[PDB]
Amino acid sequence: DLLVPKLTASVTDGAVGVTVDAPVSVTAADGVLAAVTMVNDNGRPVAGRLSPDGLRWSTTEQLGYNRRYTLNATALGLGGAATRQLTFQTSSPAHLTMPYVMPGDGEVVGVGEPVAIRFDENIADRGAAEKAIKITTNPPVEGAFYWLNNREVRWRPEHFWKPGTAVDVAVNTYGVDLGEGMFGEDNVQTHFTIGDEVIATADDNTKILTVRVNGEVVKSMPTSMGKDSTPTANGIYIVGSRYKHIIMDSSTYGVPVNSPNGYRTDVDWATQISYSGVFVHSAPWSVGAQGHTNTSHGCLNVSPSNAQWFYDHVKRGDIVEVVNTVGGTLPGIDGLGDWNIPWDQWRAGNAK
Numbered sequence: 001d002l003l004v005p006k007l008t009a010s011v012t013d014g015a016v017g018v019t020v021d022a023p024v025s026v027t028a029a030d031g032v033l034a035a036v037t038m039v040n041d042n043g044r045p046v047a048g049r050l051s052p053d054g055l056r057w058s059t060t061e062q063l064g065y066n067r068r069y070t071l072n073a074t075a076l077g078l079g080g081a082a083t084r085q086l087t088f089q090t091s092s093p094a095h096l097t098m099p100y101v102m103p104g105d106g107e108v109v110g111v112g113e114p115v116a117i118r119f120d121e122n123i124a125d126r127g128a129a130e131k132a133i134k135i136t137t138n139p140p141v142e143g144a145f146y147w148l149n150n151r152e153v154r155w156r157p158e159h160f161w162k163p164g165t166a167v168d169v170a171v172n173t174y175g176v177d178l179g180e181g182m183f184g185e186d187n188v189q190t191h192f193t194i195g196d197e198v199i200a201t202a203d204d205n206t207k208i209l210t211v212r213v214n215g216e217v218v219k220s221m222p223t224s225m226g227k228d229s230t231p232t233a234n235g236i237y238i239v240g241s242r243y244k245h246i247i248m249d250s251s252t253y254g255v256p257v258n259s260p261n262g263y264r265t266d267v268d269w270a271t272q273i274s275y276s277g278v279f280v281h282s283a284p285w286s287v288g289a290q291g292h293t294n295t296s297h298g299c300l301n302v303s304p305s306n307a308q309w310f311y312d313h314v315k316r317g318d319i320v321e322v323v324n325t326v327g328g329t330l331p332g333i334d335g336l337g338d339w340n341i342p343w344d345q346w347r348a349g350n351a352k
């Protein structure tokens, strides 16, 4: 004869510590769903949708933390009715943390821009954070996570992006335990595209900064780099913020302004290429040295003409490579020196 309806929920009655990273759902068997309601302690209805066939019902909005939810469902069929009531307690985070993703949604960036996810708290379970971040690419390319510090994680392929590539980032950290009770405050989703290949190279042996667009030299800039005592580091740099004019306070980098190697002046047409202070800026006071000798604290001294041209034609994510200098190699965890870490080490990751 007719069979008694059966109900199924994605939560268990009496569950404590239920994660809010997924929807709560009720499914019916041997019948249809006649009524479903979910409420918090205070009694406010939690939004939900029922499938046209009446078999599946799921929550249509996020669920809060430290909540006591009550789910009431009724199934009807030819073989009778069934009513269930459930109550579960959602997660109680010891602390929350909001993610911050760059580059911004819709941007077009150079072939060296890595996907960056920054949290405003230290992350204790890095693997949980890597698992909660989805990275889609078209054309699909291999990539890998690597942490610069306890709070920011990066993702890039082995070699520079092939132009025209779409990148989609889905940081689905809400409802996910990130260690020691650290849960996500919200989710984020950005998308960006890779633009022209723009690789600029600065050779200390020639003291010249050459900008190449799509493999073709388009500009040759005489420059003066870091002097022997405060030299520019060799390696690959990624282009960051661009300023029509920027006040260079030495204290920003921990070096006191009232010091031999300190400084507090205002320069024009500055393109940041290092968190540690390396720039490409306008330096009128060194035109004579530019192209011959080094007389700076680390940034590439360029004429106002060329500096502005650099400002106008170089976008976030383009590459600046420095070679044959007397200084060392840019640290891989600088924040813009990601490509200076060997691919094997980067791929391996440091999730611990």
Ligand SMILES: *[C@@H]1CC(=O)N(c2ccccc2)C1=O
Binding pocket: 248, 249, 263, 265, 267, 277, 278, 279, 296, 297, 298, 299, 300
């Ligand atoms: C790199 C960092 C900075 O701000 N620099 C500087 C510009 C003008 C005068 C003194 C120092 C650099 O060389």
